[PDB]
Amino acid sequence: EYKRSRLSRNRRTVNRAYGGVLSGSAVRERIIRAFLVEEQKIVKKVLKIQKAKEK
Amino acid sequence: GRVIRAQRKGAGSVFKSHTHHRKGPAKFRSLDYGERNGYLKGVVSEIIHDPGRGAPLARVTFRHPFRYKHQKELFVAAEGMYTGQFIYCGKKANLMVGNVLALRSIPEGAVVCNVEHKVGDRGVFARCSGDYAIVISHNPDNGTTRIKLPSGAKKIVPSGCRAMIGQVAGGGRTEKPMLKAGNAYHKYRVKRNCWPKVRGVAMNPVEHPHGGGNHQHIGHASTVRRDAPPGQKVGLIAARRTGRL
Amino acid sequence: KIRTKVTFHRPKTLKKDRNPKYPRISAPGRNKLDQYGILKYPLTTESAMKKIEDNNTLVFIVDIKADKKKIKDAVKKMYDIQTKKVNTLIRPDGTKKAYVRLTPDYDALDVANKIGI
Amino acid sequence: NPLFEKRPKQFGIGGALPPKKDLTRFVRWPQVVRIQRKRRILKQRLKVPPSLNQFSKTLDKNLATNLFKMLLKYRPEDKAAKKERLLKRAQAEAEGKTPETKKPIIVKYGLKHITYLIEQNKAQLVVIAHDVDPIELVVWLPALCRKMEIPYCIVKGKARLGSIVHKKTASALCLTTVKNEDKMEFSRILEAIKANFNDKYEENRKKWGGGVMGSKSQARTKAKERVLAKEAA
RNA sequence: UAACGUUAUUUUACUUAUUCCGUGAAUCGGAAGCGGGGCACUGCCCCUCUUUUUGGACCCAAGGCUUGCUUGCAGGCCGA
RNA sequence: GUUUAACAGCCUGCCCACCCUGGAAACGACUCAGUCGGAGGUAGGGUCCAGCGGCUGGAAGAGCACCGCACGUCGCGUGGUGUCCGGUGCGCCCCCGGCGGCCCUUGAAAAUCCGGAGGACCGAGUGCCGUCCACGCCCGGUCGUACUCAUAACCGCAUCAG
RNA sequence: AGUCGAUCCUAAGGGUCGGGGGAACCCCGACAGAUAGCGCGUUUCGCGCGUACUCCGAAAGGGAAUCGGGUUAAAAUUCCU
Ligand SMILES: [K+]
Ligand SMILES: [K+]
Ligand SMILES: [K+]
Ligand SMILES: [K+]
Ligand SMILES: [K+]
Ligand SMILES: [K+]
Ligand SMILES: [K+]
Ligand SMILES: [K+]
Ligand SMILES: [K+]
Ligand SMILES: [K+]
Ligand SMILES: [K+]
Ligand SMILES: [K+]
Ligand SMILES: [K+]
Ligand SMILES: [Mg+2]
Ligand SMILES: [Mg+2]
Ligand SMILES: [Mg+2]
Ligand SMILES: [Mg+2]
Ligand SMILES: [Mg+2]
Ligand SMILES: [Mg+2]
Ligand SMILES: [Mg+2]
């Protein structure tokens, strides 16, 4: 019954990233985790560079 | 003059294992470069019940070392692991419960489970619920490690064999009394057709060496030879002793 | 040569289409299921006549091997009449019966009179 | 211009996925390839008796090139040339009253004929392929050539010998005579071949071959020897 | 208890026969380079292969050098 | 006896789930039972989900009931009236929702369908490139289909108390 | 009968290639192996993926689509509207 020829597009889609697959809260958690993990990766890289410069 | 039950076991067709609802074999990742030299991180996604197996199993997702896809694995769950936990497998993995390490990297006195016998076999020792192996000593000269198995036997294995830190989850299962035949029926319904068991002395002579007689009794020593042929080898096989301790 | 896949795959080699020196069969076979072989005879029972009078439908006994498309084509060739739909069944005696309903442009009674039933 | 930037990839355990690499040494080859490689390995590992070992010492590159350059001018006539000669002879048979023709000087091929020529002491040089399979066909040929005092050489490629005589392969080739203009260089080549093969037959009769282990085990043995030498030093 | 020789029982070395294990046969062996450390003085020695606060994502090369000719773009080396 | 099918549109929005404001002990909310709340309750306002829910089209022209005229041998003829308004439930059959108990028992796979991450590649100026939108057009094979399903249509040597 | 089923999918299992056994009828059954092929653009050739069965096995498991009203001596969610 979900076939495209039988169901309208708006009925089988959600207008958001991962719409129809992940819930809103899960998508928010994923976005926040990605951003914070990238920031911590940058922090680790800069800390390593500073430590190498000091030594 | 009839084939006895123990003999009929080998042909199978009614004594085969019941595996319809099982989740697949539980084993480590195939040993590869990353686990041999570094470490590879995985995330526990689910802890599931495997019918016929006391120990729970953990679903772990790894990132494939050289392909763009997910590498899914099914490990025997160690007690203390949880969904969302990070699992590290390799020679450089930290010594924490749930991580899989080469025995060369595991210090003496550690508690491990699902220990490989041959390097790369993906785990054969200490897999049942509540069971574990203990690392005794290392031999750098010949690259071998000594472990204590659950039965108490001491075995020497190559130091490259892998093992998971900790003990298998689900321990203490056998301490609970069943209290009734129905519980045993349910237990063995998912394992194999080995229950209920009929005593040999309850049978007629034609189908068991213990059968027959106007009284119920064996009539001869229940200890049999190690080389006794099938159909005659019943009772206490090659017993070094009998009776209480 | 640089190989990026550990697994060996059989190389693709050229294949040739058959070009026989002689034809195994000298000539094409005859068409056994022609329009005359498809349409055996019209059914002239009371039910068939009622169908002709009421539903503008002709009833034919047809070769068991014939399908609905072949029945439609055979009816068109034999009597030059369009068919709205063809319904078929196999009778308990083992023969195939077809209910051929003509389009409104054609009158079943006139066609039956022309046929001679 | 300022919009272009580097995007370095960190390749390592748990890092960026590596690019396509050469996996040829790890390929699971078909059965034929695996067997043909393992046969060579096994032949290397096992000890080769001297009679078979003598076939591993072929002619030198320069000497082989010179010998084959000499042989290229004594090739047997091909089918077209033979047909042309036959039709010319037929045409000139009656008209020319069968004029005399000089005896041709060509290389001789075929194991039967070569063995017969050696036994009759007519051959002056015997060329033996080193890759005859089964090798029992020619393993005895060096001994026969030595006993008959006929210079012989072992060269690389039965296919090349066949190409000399317009055949897919040739087990061996023989020269019974050479032209006057080539006698001095033929004597040079014969002396070189005799010194290389015939004079060394007795010493090679007792030399075993093979016994070569794999590179990894060779490295292990070398490491053990180095450790022992350092300890004794 | 050794020069000669016979006999029997053990210990041990090699890998290609043979047997077994794993893989979608995916980095095996040696060496050398980038980096970190000791020495004393310009060389020696000792180490590593990049990923561990987080239930995220990660493929199909960016960049540099060099040729066809002036690029629809295409061909090589490094990157690896 | 006083009926309303598939299907199309609009409305509604159970029990849950989710979102916004706000920040709670004198703790409060709450079920038959439980349970929930600074990891954000009560409260106010919203989103979504089921429906075998409501209205309309289908559709009264149909079906049913009643009252009449006519041929009176063969008009499957001809006409009218009504099909309305409420209640009730530890009631019975089916479907669904949401909780709770039980397991050393945790109670299939695949075809198929839907969605998503990425973005190589791609087009024009009065026409080009796309378009899962609406309407319009054509086609849809083969075999089974009667009947009994049982104190006589199956088996039991039968039209057999099985 | 495009709409009810078979037909499609796979379950326990069955039947097999290759290989291994076997005097042979046959036995094991993807286990000893150059798999079937699948996508893009096309001078129909090139490029890229490709873990040895794309077979049988459910008229109660899974599953594309029909409803009223009418009609026969005997058929209908199949005939008529
Ligand atoms: K017996
Ligand atoms: K039983
Ligand atoms: K018993
Ligand atoms: K007895
Ligand atoms: K007894
Ligand atoms: K319907
Ligand atoms: K997309
Ligand atoms: K029927
Ligand atoms: K029936
Ligand atoms: K065989
Ligand atoms: K097989
Ligand atoms: K079915
Ligand atoms: K209808
Ligand atoms: Mg007793
Ligand atoms: Mg293959
Ligand atoms: Mg009415
Ligand atoms: Mg997108
Ligand atoms: Mg009978
Ligand atoms: Mg065979
Ligand atoms: Mg199929």
Swiss-Prot record, chain A:
The portions of this protein that span the membrane are none
Q: What's the domain of life for this entry?
A: Eukaryota
The Swiss-Prot or TrEMBL record describes its family as follows: Belongs to the eukaryotic ribosomal protein eL34 family.
- Protein name as it appears in the record: Large ribosomal subunit protein eL34
Covered part of the full sequence, start to end and full length, is: 61 to 115 of 120
Curated annotation (Swiss-Prot), chain C:
Any single GO molecular-function term of the entry would be: mRNA binding
What are the alphabetically sorted keywords of the record? Ribonucleoprotein, Ribosomal protein, RNA-binding, rRNA-binding
Its Gene Ontology cellular component terms are: cytosolic large ribosomal subunit
Task: Kindly list the biological process annotations in GO that this record carries.
Answer: translation
The Swiss-Prot or TrEMBL record describes its family as follows:
Belongs to the universal ribosomal protein uL23 family.
Described function:
This protein binds to a specific region on the 26S rRNA.
Descriptive protein name: Large ribosomal subunit protein uL23
Task: Give the species this sequence originates from.
Answer: Nicotiana tabacum
Residue range from the parent sequence: 37 to 153 of 154
